[PDB]
Amino acid sequence: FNGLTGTGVLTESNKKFLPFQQFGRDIDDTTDAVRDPQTLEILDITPCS
Amino acid sequence: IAARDLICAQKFNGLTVLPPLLTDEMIAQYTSALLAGTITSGWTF
Ligand SMILES: *[C@@H]1O[C@H](CO)[C@@H](O[C@@H]2O[C@H](CO)[C@@H](O)[C@H](O)[C@H]2NC(C)=O)[C@H](O)[C@H]1NC(C)=O
Numbered sequence A: 001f002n003g004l005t006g007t008g009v010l011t012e013s014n015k016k017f018l019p020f021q022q023f024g025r026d027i028d029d030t031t032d033a034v035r036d037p038q039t040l041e042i043l044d045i046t047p048c049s
Numbered sequence B: 001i002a003a004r005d006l007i008c009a010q011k012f013n014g015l016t017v018l019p020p021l022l023t024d025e026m027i028a029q030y031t032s033a034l035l036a037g038t039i040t041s042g043w044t045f
């Protein structure tokens, strides 16, 4: 997504990103949510098993 | 309590937390048995 790489499972989410905000963070300073630049829908990331 | 969670202890990079061998109910049963035994029998049990 938009240059940043990663691996995992994508799921639909219902978070409250501000209009200028692109992605999310976590207590472990790791990516936890993204906003795809085609439909502007919040997306949640789950690690592999 | 870990009842409905889909085993989500692992955190994104080779880090896992293992559950204890003895669940809390077993520990509670042990304490109850000790306390009932010491109430009824004394030290002879
Ligand atoms: C970027 O993404 C697509 C690229 O074509 C477009 O969005 C969709 O466009 C179709 C028409 O081709 C519409 O039927 C959809 O409703 C559009 N989707 C959305 C979410 O609007 C458009 O060019 C761009 N979309 C956005 C949201 O910027």
Ligand SMILES: *[C@@H]1O[C@H](CO)[C@@H](O[C@@H]2O[C@H](CO)[C@@H](O)[C@H](O)[C@H]2NC(C)=O)[C@H](O)[C@H]1NC(C)=O
Pocket: B004, B005, B006, B007
């Ligand atoms: C593994 O994942 C499955 C997903 O299907 C879990 O199944 C759920 O089981 C409960 C109780 O039987 C149901 O109420 C849910 O509806 C089921 N999930 C779905 C999506 O239908 C299963 O519990 C999971 N196992 C563990 C140990 O987490």
